[PDB]
Design an enzyme around this catalytic site. Structure first.
Site, short mmCIF file in Angstrom:
data_model
loop_
_atom_site.label_atom_id
_atom_site.label_comp_id
_atom_site.label_asym_id
_atom_site.label_seq_id
_atom_site.Cartn_x
_atom_site.Cartn_y
_atom_site.Cartn_z
CG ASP B 75 -0.25 -0.37 2.49
OD1 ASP B 75 0.62 -1.26 2.46
OD2 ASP B 75 -0.58 0.23 3.54
CG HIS B 136 -8.30 3.61 4.31
ND1 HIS B 136 -9.01 4.61 4.94
CD2 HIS B 136 -7.55 3.02 5.27
CE1 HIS B 136 -8.70 4.62 6.23
NE2 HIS B 136 -7.82 3.66 6.45
CG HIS B 261 -4.46 -4.86 6.23
ND1 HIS B 261 -5.52 -5.57 6.74
CD2 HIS B 261 -4.94 -4.19 5.15
CE1 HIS B 261 -6.58 -5.37 5.98
NE2 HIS B 261 -6.26 -4.54 5.01
#
Ligand SMILES: C=CC[C@@H]1/C=C(\C)C[C@H](C)C[C@H](OC)[C@H]2O[C@@](O)(C(=O)C(=O)N3CCCC[C@H]3C(=O)O[C@H](/C(C)=C/[C@@H]3CC[C@@H](O)[C@H](OC)C3)[C@H](C)[C@@H](O)CC1=O)[C@H](C)C[C@@H]2OC
Ligand SMILES: CC(C)NC[C@H](O)COc1cccc2[nH]c3ccccc3c12
Lengths: 107, 350, 432
Positions: B75, B136, B261
């Site tokens: 991410d 998100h 994550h």
């Protein structure tokens, strides 16, 4: 109200005075953990002097209970916070504040 | 005067009216060199880029098919310049293919720029780069966090709505080489086999609970060595244990599962080694160096080539400054102007 | 000689036109001056410009050539235009006087009841009344006289000598320069006998006692050192700036004429506009009306100290200015500022207990000078006309024409007086 909950204590031989200026690195938050500002986003510590009313009263009466080189937590109530009006932009009205201030240097 | 300190480059003040950024296939190099200087784009051009990205992403299957020689990245969370350094480190998109996994928007002041650049390069390169949905890319989280204010300050709210309707169509399974499975979060007890993630409707906002609400929110056990136990960290999905992942890998022929994550100081983590085969069964990747400017984590990026798994570390890069919640200095300083003026005058008068 | 007289006339008309054009332009688009009194002033300015353009070159040509060969019906047009210009310069001054009289008795009532619509309505009404009183009496030929010379000149296309009938002369003088003159004098006398009482309200006396106590050298002025004599004020970051807004004429110190005028800006009776303008004027380091990059950077650099990097502060300032430029100049005006700020509710934070409002006592002196100079210059023409119309008939055939040119110079004088006002100066410098 102000509550100080120490995570890491420091040396108790020195305490800040009213006429002294404290240089700290702080990472403010809110009641639900939504971080709103910090002093590590910029690479520069934040300095303030006690006595005069430039910081909120919660800081003034809470940091005095700390010690040198101690990282702790604060839960500033709306009474000593920005009040009913609230700072425009960040802090909503009637917003409890949570802080993670860490004292670094004196004067 | 004109400029008190001249060392800082002046942000360009003119938007681009689709004259240069499009040749229709767009131009990437000029878009990079324009957004890397805090430039800007016209509202119509941004809407066109996002709409074309959504149109080219809607046709994608829920479970992507990706060949062997690949590069996997974690991410980003809005760090534009770190993304550019990542592209430089991993090589040009022309000579290599990527698999972006995590979320792209929240918790950063350069989210719209990052999503624009990624989706423009997706438009230009439709087969050598695959985007995956994160945790998100919802209305609730982005309204909660600092992405809505990004869109409002930089562009109009119509850009926000278009970007959300475009996130609505992202894929979520992305099988790789039929030997590795790459999901943003983790497994869920509700999902039994791969077919379960080959048919579910992915074109909707995630519900309070379910398969899609658990795939993006699950999390492996954080204190291994002490199946569907509830989450206290998030409060919306479950765990999965080593027997659970072992059973999933035994039911469907696979080797490992990847996730993005857990922000990690090392950047990459290999979980418990699979005793049956010798290769780790769960891999955690993070590719956002200096997360929140306080973590001081060296990011990681994985490469799979010639039947070899290897990990490359990743450093940081400087970025400009923004005020929290994007205040303009008038709103920043006016309450400290009024208080001081009134204090001085009350002091003088009385 | 003829060359000198022609040069004088050319200079007079050119100066009149240039000054009046400057005055009209300063209120046309640079609309920081948005007061109803300013609309009356611009009505007066366009009136006297019309007077200039119409009569001044024509009168100069008539005087120089010793014959007025333009025509015969143009004679009536010329005389009627002159009469209209004088009457519309009188009644506009009377309207300004009564306006300023009601704008002191009840400030809130005046600002609430009266707006631009009523301003335009009454300006048009007085212009129509003057137009009627100028056009109709001339065209009905009531100025006819029984003199043989008057009869000959009436049936002649060159003379165009204004000959007056006794009844018409008396009526014109009593309805154009005697009733409105006494009315304006009476009303403005009442203004100065109640605008010199508001300065004796037992509040400004207390501030005078405070002013006397604060001053050390007893020289009648307040300097930066004397504001910094207070031990509980030496640590205010933006203390110099508030003194700089107080210090209006740039002399270097504050006096009681501007002390109490600036403190009254922070009053409950004041509006949002005044306090918001003060907040704006905190930033301007030149009072020129625009906030540059350097001004908005140094204002924040004296406040934030060394809590942010120089580069970071410059970057946020650049982004702010780019987000504020609605036209592309590179600086922020007051309208752009009010687009940016306003809704933060800053007018409720700059509050002081003072209960005196003196925001209309700023334009009485220039208006008073205008009225006094105008009356002083245009009275002799009417008094000598009255002397001539009576059977006395003193020998004044020459000065009776010189007083007309005195009146013309008077009609030109106005922009010279208006240039004295400091706010008009910087607006003029914009064109220069
Ligand atoms: C440009 C000049 C303005 C001047 C800016 C600076 C000095 C730069 C400095 C790094 C401030 C930060 O700027 C990035 C930023 O710090 C916050 O993020 C923050 O974590 C905070 O709450 N802090 C900071 C740490 C001390 C406690 C508290 C504070 O008391 O701060 C003080 C504060 C807000 C006073 C209020 C003002 C409103 C009154 O109503 C209230 O009276 C009760 C008292 C500080 C000392 C003010 O001097 C802030 C200013 O306005 C605020 C959320 C908003 C604030 O920026 C505004
Ligand atoms: C000789 C003429 C052309 N000169 C006229 C003067 O400009 C000003 O005269 C007046 C101005 C305003 C009202 C007036 N009523 C009058 C009656 C008789 C004569 C002059 C005026 C007069």
């Amino acid at each position: 109200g102000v509550q100080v909950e120490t995570i890491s204590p420091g040396d108790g031989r020195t305490f800040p005075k009213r006429g002294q200026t404290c240089v700290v690195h702080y990472t403010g938050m809110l009641e639900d953990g939504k971080k709103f500002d910090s002093s590590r986003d910029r690479n520069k510590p934040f300095k303030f002097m006690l006595g005069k009313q430039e910081v909120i009263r919660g800081w003034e009466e809470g940091v005095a209970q700390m010690s040198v080189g101690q990282r702790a937590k604060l839960t500033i109530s709306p009474d000593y916070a920005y009040g009913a009006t609230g700072h425009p932009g960040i802090i909503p009205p009637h917003a409890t504040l949570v802080f993670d201030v860490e004292l670094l240097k004196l004067e | 005067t004109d400029r008190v300190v001249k060392a800082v480059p002046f942000p360009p003040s003119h938007r681009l009216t689709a004259k240069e950024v499009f040749d229709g296939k767009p131009r990437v190099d000029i878009l990079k060199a324009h957004l890397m200087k805090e430039g800007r784009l016209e509202e119509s051009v941004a809407l066109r880029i996002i709409t074309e990205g959504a149109s080219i992403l809607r046709q994608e299957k829920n479970l992507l098919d990706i060949d062997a020689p690949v590069t996997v990245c974690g991410d980003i969370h809005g760090q534009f310049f770190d993304l550019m350094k990542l592209f430089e480190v991993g090589g040009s998109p022309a000579n290599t293919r990527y698999l972006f996994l995590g979320d792209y928007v929240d918790r950063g002041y350069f989210s719209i720029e990052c999503v624009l650049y990624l989706w423009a390069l997706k438009i230009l390169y439709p087969k050598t780069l695959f985007l995956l949905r994160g945790n998100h890319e919802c209305r609730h989280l982005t309204e909660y966090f600092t992405f809505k204010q990004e869109c409002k300050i930089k562009y109009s709210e119509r850009v926000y709505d278009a970007c959300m309707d475009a996130f609505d169509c992202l894929p979520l399974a992305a099988l790789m080489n039929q030997q590795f499975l790459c999901v943003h979060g983790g497994l869920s007890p509700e999902i039994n086999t791969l077919d379960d993630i080959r048919k579910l409707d992915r074109f909707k906002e995630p519900p309070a609970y379910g398969p899609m609400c658990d795939i993006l929110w699950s999390d492996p056990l954080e204190d291994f060595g002490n199946h569907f136990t509830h989450n206290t960290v998030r409060g919306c999905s479950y765990f999965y244990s080593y027997p659970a992942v072992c059973d999933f890998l035994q039911h469907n022929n696979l080797l490992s599962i990847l996730r993005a994550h857990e922000a990690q100081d090392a950047g990459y983590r290999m979980y418990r080694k699979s005793q049956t085969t010798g290769f780790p069964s769960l891999i955690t990747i993070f590719s956002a160096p200096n997360y929140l400017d306080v973590y001081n984590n060296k990011a990681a990026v994985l490469k799979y080539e010639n039947n070899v798994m290897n990990i490359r570390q990743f450093n940081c890069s400087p970025h400009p400054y923004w005020l929290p919640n994007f205040m303009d200095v008038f709103t920043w300083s006016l309450p400290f102007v009024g208080e001081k003026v009134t204090e001085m005058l009350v002091n003088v008068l009385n | 000689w003829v060359v000198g007289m022609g040069i004088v006339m050319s200079l007079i008309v050119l100066a009149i036109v240039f000054g009046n054009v400057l005055v009209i332009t300063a209120i046309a688009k640079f609309e920081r001056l948005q007061t109803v009194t300013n609309y009356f002033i611009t009505s007066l300015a366009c009136a006297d410009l019309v007077m200039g353009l119409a009569v001044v070159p024509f009168g100069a040509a008539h005087i120089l050539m010793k014959m007025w060969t333009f025509g015969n019906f143009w004679c009536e047009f010329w005389t009627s235009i002159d009469v209209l210009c004088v009457t519309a310069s009188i009644e506009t001054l009377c309207v300004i006087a009564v306006d300023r009289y009601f704008a002191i008795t009840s400030p809130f009532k005046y600002q609430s009841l009266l707006t631009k619509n009523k301003a335009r309505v009454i300006i048009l009404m007085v212009w129509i009344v003057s137009g009627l009183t100028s056009f109709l009496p001339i065209q009905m030929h009531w100025y006819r006289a029984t003199h043989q010379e008057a009869i000959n000149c009436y049936a002649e296309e060159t003379c165009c000598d204004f000959f007056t009938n006794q009844a018409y002369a008396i009526a014109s003088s009593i309805v154009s320069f005697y009733v409105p003159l006494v009315i304006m004098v009476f009303v403005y006398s009442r203004v100065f006998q109640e605008a010199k009482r508001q300065l004796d309200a037992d509040e400004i006396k207390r501030l005078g006692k405070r002013f006397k106590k604060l001053d050390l050298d007893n020289s009648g002025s307040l300097s930066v050192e004397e504001f910094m004599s207070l031990p509980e004020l030496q640590q205010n970051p933006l203390v110099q700036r508030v003194i700089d807004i107080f210090d209006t004429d740039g002399n270097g110190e504050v006096d009681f004429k501007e002390f109490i005028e600036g403190v009254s800006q922070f009053s409950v009776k004041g509006d949002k506009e005044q306090k918001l303008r003060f907040a704006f004027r905190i930033y301007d380091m030149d009072k020129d009306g625009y906030i540059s990059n350097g001004e908005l950077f140094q204002v924040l650099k004296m406040m934030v100290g060394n809590n942010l990097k120089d580069t970071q502060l410059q970057q946020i300032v650049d982004k702010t200015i780019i987000n504020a430029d609605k036209d592309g100049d590179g600086r922020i005006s007051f309208e752009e500022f009010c687009a940016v700020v306003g809704g933060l509710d800053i007018h409720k934070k700059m509050v002081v207990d003072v209960k005196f409002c003196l925001k209309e006592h700023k334009a009485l002196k220039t208006l008073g000078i205008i009225m006094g100079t105008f009356t002083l210059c245009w009275l002799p023409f009417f008094i000598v006309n009255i002397v001539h119309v009576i059977q006395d008939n003193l020998i004044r055939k020459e000065v009776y024409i010189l007083l007309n040119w005195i009146g013309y110079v008077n009609s030109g004088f106005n922009p010279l007086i208006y240039c004295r006002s400091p706010d008009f100066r910087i607006a003029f410098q914009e064109l220069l």
